[PDB]
């Protein structure tokens, strides 16, 4: 894969209860490093990872200002969208944005991203060529025309190919001790009798990073996909992740089941048994 940086913006209107609230979080791969909340008393971009704390006041002032500007811009956008869709000012609406870069082994941009969603639906996205847009509907085509005329794609391309990957490389080096270190899962199998006839085997993967992982049960070397309960990968709360997979087995057949774990932190794929 490739290392990445992403910013996630969320603005939500609240008619009758003031202006829309803007929230921003930034990630390097699966590690959050900054946050901003427009409802805060003194709205500031704040550190969220140890390796970003070293950045100077100029960094925090600049990014705080951009977030303040983005707060106002999103409020204009929300107003604008309401008009495009002929919606009243009574209902709450949501605007989301994700953007960022993937850096390649040469240290150059591997792929750039910049996409928007309105009320949970794809609205407009910058294509991989970073020079054109994909608009979801007629409303988004109005936005497209504005952004074409304003040469938005070019400006973003410049950011993505330069600033973005430059700072990403910086973060990766400053936080190398954690960001460029893969923590393999601590794994085990538990056994939970359901009756005299069956029991649950649950395969655990705990304390791993990054979040990407594969957990599978096999019986006699055959995949048990459609019989396995796979929970969504979840945060431990300490910057690492958790996941488990479970299968119901006939009593006395436990030995025929094997759990298989793939993760970039492992020397090699694991096979587990009860």
């Amino acid at each position: 894969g490739s290392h990445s940086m992403r910013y996630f913006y969320t603005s939500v209107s609240r008619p009758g209860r003031g202006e829309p609230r803007f929230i921003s979080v930034g990630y390097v791969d699966d590690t959050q490093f900054v946050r901003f909340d427009s409802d805060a008393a003194s709205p500031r971009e704040e550190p969220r990872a140890p390796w970003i704390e070293q950045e100077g006041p100029e960094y925090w002032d600049r990014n705080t200002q951009i977030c303040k500007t983005n707060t106002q811009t999103d409020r204009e956008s929300l107003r604008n969208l309401r008009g495009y869709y002929n919606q009243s000012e009574a209902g709450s609406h949501t605007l989301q944005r994700m953007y960022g870069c993937d850096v390649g082994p040469d240290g150059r941009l591997l792929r750039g991203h910049n996409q928007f969603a309105y009320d949970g639906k794809d609205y407009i996205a910058l294509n991989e060529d970073l020079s054109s847009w994909t608009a979801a509907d007629t409303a988004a085509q109005i936005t497209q025309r504005k952004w074409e005329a304003a040469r938005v794609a070019e400006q973003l391309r410049t950011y993505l190919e330069g600033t973005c990957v430059e700072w990403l490389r910086r973060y990766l080096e400053n936080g190398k001790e954690t960001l460029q270190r893969a923590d393999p899962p601590k794994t085990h199998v538990t056994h939970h009798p359901i009756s005299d006839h069956e029991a649950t085997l649950r395969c655990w993967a705990l304390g791993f990073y990054p979040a990407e992982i594969t957990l599978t049960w096999q019986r006699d070397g055959e995949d048990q996909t459609q019989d396995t309960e796979l929970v969504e990968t979840r945060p431990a709360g300490d910057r690492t992740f958790q996941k488990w997979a479970a299968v119901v087995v006939p009593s006395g057949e436990e030995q025929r089941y094997t759990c298989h774990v793939q993760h970039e932190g492992l020397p090699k794929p694991l096979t587990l048994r009860w």
Partner: peptide, 8 residues
């Protein structure tokens, strides 16, 4: 953050 400002 990107310092490019354009309302939808």
């Amino acid at each position: 953050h990107v310092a490019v400002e354009n309302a939808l």
